[PDB]
Write a protein that binds this ligand. Structure first.
Ligand code: HEM
Ligand code: HEM
Ligand SMILES: Cc1cc(N)nc(CCc2cc(F)cc(CCCN(C)C)c2)c1
Ligand SMILES: Cc1cc(N)nc(CCc2cc(F)cc(CCCN(C)C)c2)c1
Ligand SMILES: C[C@H](O)[C@H](O)[C@H]1CNc2nc(N)[nH]c(=O)c2N1
Ligand SMILES: C[C@H](O)[C@H](O)[C@H]1CNc2nc(N)[nH]c(=O)c2N1
Ligand SMILES: [Cl-]
Ligand SMILES: [Cl-]
Ligand SMILES: [Gd]
Ligand SMILES: [Gd]
Ligand SMILES: [Zn+2]
Lengths: 404, 402
């Protein structure tokens, strides 16, 4: 059992939960591959094994392991797979599995919220227009006029033979990325590719660097089709700085709802290639990574010139100064627009609290240091000085190949 | 079947084939990654030595020659008669350089070839040990124009105890416990401070009192030595535009000299081999001054800046730390003492990664130590995937002699 120390306080804990980590990660005794974004790469006998495991801790959670429907629920799954090859989850199980998968996400710093998740059951949807309506209900419910609420919508489980439901965008809200004469990009460079696929599927392109892309939604086998998002459903926050008057004039915006729509949900060995989840932003995500990454909007320099900073020498720390103000603008703007957002200090402090809860509850917590520590001011947050153990638990969210 | 490594800023892809040569095992398994943990006979001495000799003769473009095989035959003969062997001087110098080159958590390695190696293997006592160290500090500091160096004391050897420097660095500030249960000075140094006191040291009462050296000759108790004040170059900290900053009375020293690590070369172990470079400004500004468990000045600086410390969303922590780092850079540049900021340093580490890929087919690197403690993704190393592993020669941690 790995010994884990916190270097700020000097406290020691042991991660006993790691002992039940199965689906092996990328690392070996000879080399650590912890920093890698995608680890490695992306007879029904196996299905039952994962199913019994999932059902077993469901009843552990609600006390009733031993006797009662715990007994009973086990055979139905057994019978259901024997008869049909796959099985269907009880609604409560779907709910429990969805929360568990979020609980188990090593890279998520917001997991103190894992208990508060609204699960929409969309396993009875069988059309692209149906998905779109399901997505739109989600977006509307999750956005909630700016008082954001964590939400996941779960579409039908993958079946052997015949295709899958699948959202082609990485998120429900993504901004356009347009190539050009110089091969450079107006808009978001992260989304240039899906922008490419949007246009070659019949989407009329747009103005500039903040065009909300359409959804490319895909029902089984029958190839994808475009769906335009209602403007009133897509909540956005124009970016202003509380004291730097010119910041507004930079014309920056970001959307309200971070909703990830390309990850595969695994509960009890069943796979949901379409299960979009949503929460609310940590401000560094927008202010530091989206706006300031060299390969994203890359605005750092432009903001520095406006602040009349000395960009002639790295040792003026002009990047650092401009980054902080871009972050200050994000927090101020979202607060002004009354849109739920959390700063990286508050978020990491809550995660520390989440660590201690999980220590008592499960004897440890899978955490990926490199993704939990914020992208600015890392050592000024408590998680920096906290050792972590990273491993895979089920239920879980996994990456998956893209539909092309 | 070598690890694929991507740079996400640019889109580069390389394969770390060097990792396959990893001569030792770290803490990670397929079950779990322990990457963020801070702390992770003749026949085996023989195969270690044989691999280092192979390395040395590769580096001088003399692999497989007569001189090469002769040296191999000499080494395994000397292990037969004495249970050990001695490095030739050129082998020692190469070995110390590789150890730096091989250190996964060092962002400064672009410099690895420029290292002054002082051979103190003939050192006979603690008193002589002290003289060697004083010369190291004097050469390395060089009146503020810092030069990288290592001094190598006698290797661990059968029959005799170890040379050890008890201090974790050659220059450290005292850390005194208080009536508040508090600490006056550097809290990281309470233990060594206590040891010094109970070994005869007359303690000070300031926040920046330079510690004496506790130096251990084989099978001897440690002996206390005071550093000549004028040997220890310091920099009072001031801020280019915040004039009240100077009144905080903060200082730091010029020379970062790590002195409690073990240098391992071809299976031989050097328990005492202090090495020194020059500071990256974040070590001082962010970690030494702002860690809650170090000098912890962040809040007092923010209040002075008249930031709103009631709420986290004003980012008072981020703003104060940025100015503390500016202060450090300004002060060192003013004082004409070598310093590198985290942007230049990470930029040069990227060049090292590129050099090393051409040279060795990769480079051992610990992402979490290489990414600076502030402004991580503003630096190019953040977006670079890395493979952590152990190569030898190497610097290793070792237990405290007490
Ligand atoms: C409610 C507030 C939430 C906050 C503040 C938050 C914050 C974050 C952040 C900052 C990341 C870093 C990933 C990156 O930068 O690419 C992340 C990752 C992640 N989050 Fe959350 N999150 C929240 C809600 C949720 C919810 C509701 C779920 C699932 C139901 C979830 C599941 C995940 C997963 C699976 C990752 C892994 C990222 C990856 O592997 O690419 N999070 N979260
Ligand atoms: C010359 C400029 C140098 C710079 C800018 C530099 C920078 C750094 C930094 C920032 C760290 C980690 C900081 C921390 O532990 O909080 C580090 C670690 C390290 N450095 Fe360098 N260094 C330099 C010279 C050297 C030299 C000359 C050597 C040895 C000959 C060396 C060997 C090491 C080793 C072994 C570690 C990691 C040890 C540990 O993890 O505790 N460095 N370096
Ligand atoms: C749910 C949620 C909350 C929040 N605060 N932020 C997010 C966005 C971060 C994110 C979370 C996530 F789970 C997936 C992605 C996209 C994939 C990223 N890698 C593979 C390149 C992004 C998502
Ligand atoms: C040589 C050198 C140059 C430079 N710029 N900075 C340093 C100090 C960094 C350092 C380098 C080192 F090798 C050891 C330590 C102390 C160990 C701390 N860990 C266990 C938490 C610190 C050393
Ligand atoms: C190379 C490195 O592992 C990679 O850039 C990771 C580091 N940590 C991260 N952390 C978060 N939250 N998001 C990211 O995209 C990354 N990128
Ligand atoms: C737990 C965590 O690994 C630890 O606090 C590390 C993080 N990264 C670091 N990076 C450097 N350069 N120096 C450090 O001391 C640390 N501390
Ligand atoms: Cl985002
Ligand atoms: Cl230091
Ligand atoms: Gd102006
Ligand atoms: Gd002033
Ligand atoms: Zn690992």
């Amino acid at each position: 059992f790995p010994r884990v120390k916190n270097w700020e306080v000097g406290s020691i804990t042991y991660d006993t939960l790691s002992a039940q980590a199965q689906q092996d990660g990328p690392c070996t005794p000879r080399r650590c591959l912890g920093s890698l974004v995608f680890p490695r790469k992306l007879a029904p006998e196996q299905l039952l094994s994962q199913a019994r495991d999932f059902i077993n801790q469901y009843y552990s959670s609600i006390k009733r392991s031993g006797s009662q429907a715990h007994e009973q629920r086990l055979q139905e799954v057994e019978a259901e797979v024997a008869a049909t090859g796959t099985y269907q989850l009880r609604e409560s199980e779907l709910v429990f599995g969805a929360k568990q998968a979020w609980r188990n996400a090593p890279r998520c710093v917001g997991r103190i919220q894992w208990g508060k998740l609204q699960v929409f059951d969309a396993r009875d949807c069988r059309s692209a227009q149906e998905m779109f309506t399901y997505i739109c209900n989600h977006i509307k419910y999750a956005t909630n006029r700016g008082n954001l609420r964590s939400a996941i919508t779960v579409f039908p489980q993958r079946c052997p033979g015949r295709g899958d439901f699948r959202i082609w965008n990485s998120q429900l809200v993504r901004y356009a990325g347009y190539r050009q004469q110089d091969g450079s990009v107006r808009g978001d460079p992260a989304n240039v590719e899906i922008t490419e696929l949007c246009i070659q599927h019949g989407w009329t392109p747009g103005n500039g660097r903040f065009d909300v892309l359409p959804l490319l939604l895909q029902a089984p086998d029958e190839p994808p089709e475009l769906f335009l998002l209602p403007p009133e459903l897509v909540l956005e926050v124009p970016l202003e700085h509380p004291t730097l008057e010119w910041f507004a004039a930079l014309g920056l915006r970001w959307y309200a709802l971070p909703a990830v729509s390309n990850m595969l949900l695994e509960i009890g060995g069943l796979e949901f290639p379409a299960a979009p989840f949503s929460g609310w932003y940590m401000s560094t995500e927008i202010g530091t990574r989206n706006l300031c990454d060299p390969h994203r909007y890359n605005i750092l320099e432009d903001v520095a010139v406006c602040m009349d900073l000395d960009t002639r020498t790295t040792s003026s720390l002009w990047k650092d100064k401009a980054a902080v103000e871009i972050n200050v603008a994000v927090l101020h703007s979202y607060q002004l627009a009354k849109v739920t957002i959390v700063d990286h200090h508050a978020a990491t402090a809550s995660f520390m609290k989440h660590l201690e809860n999980e220590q008592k509850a499960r004897g440890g917590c899978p955490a990926d240091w490199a993704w939990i520590v914020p992208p600015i001011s890392g050592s000024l947050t408590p998680v920096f000085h906290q050792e972590m153990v990273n491993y895979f638990l089920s239920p879980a969210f996994r990456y998956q190949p893209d539909p092309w």
